[PDB]
């Protein structure tokens, strides 16, 4: 059974657009999305479809790139650090649910390295 997906809008949360957040969408997220290993991360984990009934028994703060992309598109975040934390949550969830050497974990490790390379330097506000 699947929980509701994370929110992509929140009317009482203040919005912001910064050069860093624009770069996270146009360059970082959009580049990661094209990678051959990105597909497991492009939407919320479907535990009903994937026959993973214990996924949400274990992962209590779900995150995926589809949600991040919609958040960035909505100006949901106040700053880049908030968005970067949602990427880190997404990678960490994969490491928590799975074990070292698992195919899904190799995909996450490669994306995380690419992610870090791209966020090492961000634009200046
Ligand atoms: O175990 C899987 N997971 C497990 C954990 C995570 S975290 C982000 C995407 C996924 C997908 N599979 C297995 C087949 N496709 C995804």
mmCIF file of C-alpha atoms and ligand atoms in Angstrom:
data_model
loop_
_atom_site.group_PDB
_atom_site.id
_atom_site.type_symbol
_atom_site.label_atom_id
_atom_site.label_comp_id
_atom_site.label_asym_id
_atom_site.label_seq_id
_atom_site.Cartn_x
_atom_site.Cartn_y
_atom_site.Cartn_z
ATOM 1 C CA UNK A 1 0.000 0.000 0.000
ATOM 2 C CA UNK A 2 1.103 3.472 -1.119
ATOM 3 C CA UNK A 3 1.006 6.638 1.053
ATOM 4 C CA UNK A 4 -0.007 9.946 -0.491
ATOM 5 C CA UNK A 5 2.961 11.427 -2.402
ATOM 6 C CA UNK A 6 4.898 14.361 -0.863
ATOM 7 C CA UNK A 7 3.377 17.785 -1.405
ATOM 8 C CA UNK A 8 4.492 19.807 -4.371
ATOM 9 C CA UNK A 9 2.669 22.988 -3.256
ATOM 10 C CA UNK A 10 1.897 24.498 0.105
ATOM 11 C CA UNK A 11 -0.004 27.816 0.133
ATOM 12 C CA UNK A 12 1.092 28.847 3.568
ATOM 13 C CA UNK A 13 4.800 28.156 2.892
ATOM 14 C CA UNK A 14 6.613 31.165 1.336
ATOM 15 C CA UNK A 15 8.059 30.754 -2.146
ATOM 16 C CA UNK A 16 11.319 31.994 -3.558
ATOM 17 C CA UNK A 17 13.293 31.955 -6.784
ATOM 18 C CA UNK A 18 17.070 32.293 -6.636
ATOM 19 C CA UNK A 19 19.816 31.815 -9.190
ATOM 20 C CA UNK A 20 20.885 28.628 -7.342
ATOM 21 C CA UNK A 21 17.360 27.167 -7.396
ATOM 22 C CA UNK A 22 17.033 27.965 -11.126
ATOM 23 C CA UNK A 23 20.360 26.177 -11.749
ATOM 24 C CA UNK A 24 19.206 23.182 -9.675
ATOM 25 C CA UNK A 25 16.272 22.771 -12.047
ATOM 26 C CA UNK A 26 17.770 23.723 -15.423
ATOM 27 C CA UNK A 27 21.138 22.097 -15.019
ATOM 28 C CA UNK A 28 21.330 19.723 -12.103
ATOM 29 C CA UNK A 29 17.924 17.974 -12.037
ATOM 30 C CA UNK A 30 17.419 18.044 -15.806
ATOM 31 C CA UNK A 31 20.842 16.584 -16.422
ATOM 32 C CA UNK A 32 20.496 13.827 -13.773
ATOM 33 C CA UNK A 33 17.072 12.980 -15.274
ATOM 34 C CA UNK A 34 18.737 11.902 -18.516
ATOM 35 C CA UNK A 35 21.131 9.501 -16.980
ATOM 36 C CA UNK A 36 20.639 5.846 -17.718
ATOM 37 C CA UNK A 37 20.204 5.097 -14.010
ATOM 38 C CA UNK A 38 17.668 7.890 -13.299
ATOM 39 C CA UNK A 39 14.466 5.936 -14.020
ATOM 40 C CA UNK A 40 13.903 4.404 -10.587
ATOM 41 C CA UNK A 41 14.044 7.896 -9.083
ATOM 42 C CA UNK A 42 11.777 9.776 -11.512
ATOM 43 C CA UNK A 43 8.616 9.068 -9.472
ATOM 44 C CA UNK A 44 7.554 8.036 -6.024
ATOM 45 C CA UNK A 45 8.309 4.402 -5.252
ATOM 46 C CA UNK A 46 5.155 2.438 -6.168
ATOM 47 C CA UNK A 47 5.030 -0.273 -3.557
ATOM 48 C CA UNK A 48 1.784 -1.788 -5.014
ATOM 49 C CA UNK A 49 3.188 -1.886 -8.609
ATOM 50 C CA UNK A 50 6.722 -3.021 -7.536
ATOM 51 C CA UNK A 51 5.493 -5.604 -5.048
ATOM 52 C CA UNK A 52 7.300 -3.912 -2.161
ATOM 53 C CA UNK A 53 4.739 -3.913 0.629
ATOM 54 C CA UNK A 54 7.349 -3.187 3.314
ATOM 55 C CA UNK A 55 8.912 -0.116 1.529
ATOM 56 C CA UNK A 56 6.777 2.446 3.422
ATOM 57 C CA UNK A 57 6.948 0.391 6.573
ATOM 58 C CA UNK A 58 10.634 1.257 6.504
ATOM 59 C CA UNK A 59 10.932 4.605 4.626
ATOM 60 C CA UNK A 60 9.013 7.356 6.479
ATOM 61 C CA UNK A 61 10.200 10.423 4.575
ATOM 62 C CA UNK A 62 9.830 9.462 0.929
ATOM 63 C CA UNK A 63 11.389 11.562 -1.816
ATOM 64 C CA UNK A 64 11.911 11.268 -5.610
ATOM 65 C CA UNK A 65 13.077 13.438 -8.504
ATOM 66 C CA UNK A 66 9.624 13.837 -9.936
ATOM 67 C CA UNK A 67 8.507 15.502 -6.737
ATOM 68 C CA UNK A 68 11.682 17.617 -6.624
ATOM 69 C CA UNK A 69 11.166 18.711 -10.193
ATOM 70 C CA UNK A 70 7.516 19.758 -9.483
ATOM 71 C CA UNK A 71 8.717 21.606 -6.338
ATOM 72 C CA UNK A 72 11.317 23.456 -8.302
ATOM 73 C CA UNK A 73 8.770 24.221 -11.074
ATOM 74 C CA UNK A 74 6.341 25.598 -8.437
ATOM 75 C CA UNK A 75 9.028 27.763 -6.607
ATOM 76 C CA UNK A 76 8.160 25.651 -3.541
ATOM 77 C CA UNK A 77 11.612 25.999 -1.947
ATOM 78 C CA UNK A 78 12.962 29.019 -0.097
ATOM 79 C CA UNK A 79 16.592 28.192 -0.971
ATOM 80 C CA UNK A 80 18.977 25.722 -2.676
ATOM 81 C CA UNK A 81 19.875 24.001 0.591
ATOM 82 C CA UNK A 82 16.254 22.948 1.066
ATOM 83 C CA UNK A 83 16.236 21.363 -2.393
ATOM 84 C CA UNK A 84 19.602 19.752 -1.918
ATOM 85 C CA UNK A 85 18.259 18.179 1.286
ATOM 86 C CA UNK A 86 15.423 16.546 -0.666
ATOM 87 C CA UNK A 87 18.034 14.997 -3.060
ATOM 88 C CA UNK A 88 19.999 13.756 -0.072
ATOM 89 C CA UNK A 89 16.782 12.251 1.433
ATOM 90 C CA UNK A 90 16.082 10.472 -1.868
ATOM 91 C CA UNK A 91 19.582 8.917 -1.971
ATOM 92 C CA UNK A 92 19.616 8.018 1.718
ATOM 93 C CA UNK A 93 16.209 6.295 1.457
ATOM 94 C CA UNK A 94 17.594 4.033 -1.223
ATOM 95 C CA UNK A 95 20.583 3.142 0.997
ATOM 96 C CA UNK A 96 18.366 2.454 3.975
ATOM 97 C CA UNK A 97 15.849 0.146 2.155
ATOM 98 C CA UNK A 98 18.598 -1.740 0.193
ATOM 99 C CA UNK A 99 22.057 -3.229 0.835
ATOM 100 C CA UNK A 100 25.483 -2.390 -0.543
ATOM 101 C CA UNK A 101 26.008 -3.997 -3.969
ATOM 102 C CA UNK A 102 22.286 -4.176 -4.833
ATOM 103 C CA UNK A 103 21.605 -3.021 -8.355
ATOM 104 C CA UNK A 104 19.358 -0.147 -7.211
ATOM 105 C CA UNK A 105 22.108 0.974 -4.800
ATOM 106 C CA UNK A 106 24.715 1.028 -7.559
ATOM 107 C CA UNK A 107 22.361 3.273 -9.548
ATOM 108 C CA UNK A 108 21.875 5.602 -6.548
ATOM 109 C CA UNK A 109 25.670 5.719 -5.857
ATOM 110 C CA UNK A 110 26.356 6.780 -9.447
ATOM 111 C CA UNK A 111 23.652 9.454 -9.400
ATOM 112 C CA UNK A 112 24.802 10.764 -6.077
ATOM 113 C CA UNK A 113 28.350 11.172 -7.394
ATOM 114 C CA UNK A 114 27.076 13.020 -10.427
ATOM 115 C CA UNK A 115 24.820 15.155 -8.204
ATOM 116 C CA UNK A 116 27.694 16.146 -5.970
ATOM 117 C CA UNK A 117 29.874 16.996 -8.923
ATOM 118 C CA UNK A 118 27.168 19.355 -10.194
ATOM 119 C CA UNK A 119 26.411 21.097 -6.906
ATOM 120 C CA UNK A 120 30.089 21.546 -5.918
ATOM 121 C CA UNK A 121 29.871 24.888 -7.614
ATOM 122 C CA UNK A 122 26.674 26.837 -7.820
ATOM 123 C CA UNK A 123 25.917 30.225 -9.288
ATOM 124 C CA UNK A 124 26.233 33.353 -7.158
ATOM 125 C CA UNK A 125 23.015 35.171 -6.013
HETATM 126 O O1 LIG B 1 14.008 -1.936 -4.847
HETATM 127 C C1 LIG B 1 13.690 -1.031 -5.691
HETATM 128 N N1 LIG B 1 13.685 0.324 -5.127
HETATM 129 C C2 LIG B 1 14.083 0.326 -3.754
HETATM 130 C C3 LIG B 1 14.438 1.528 -3.084
HETATM 131 C C4 LIG B 1 14.338 2.750 -3.936
HETATM 132 S S1 LIG B 1 14.648 4.269 -3.402
HETATM 133 C C5 LIG B 1 14.328 5.072 -4.848
HETATM 134 C C6 LIG B 1 13.871 4.150 -5.902
HETATM 135 C C7 LIG B 1 13.874 2.744 -5.299
HETATM 136 C C8 LIG B 1 13.423 1.473 -5.959
HETATM 137 N N2 LIG B 1 13.352 -1.389 -7.122
HETATM 138 C C9 LIG B 1 13.340 -2.668 -7.595
HETATM 139 C C10 LIG B 1 12.981 -2.594 -8.940
HETATM 140 N N3 LIG B 1 12.827 -1.311 -9.316
HETATM 141 C C11 LIG B 1 13.043 -0.576 -8.180
#
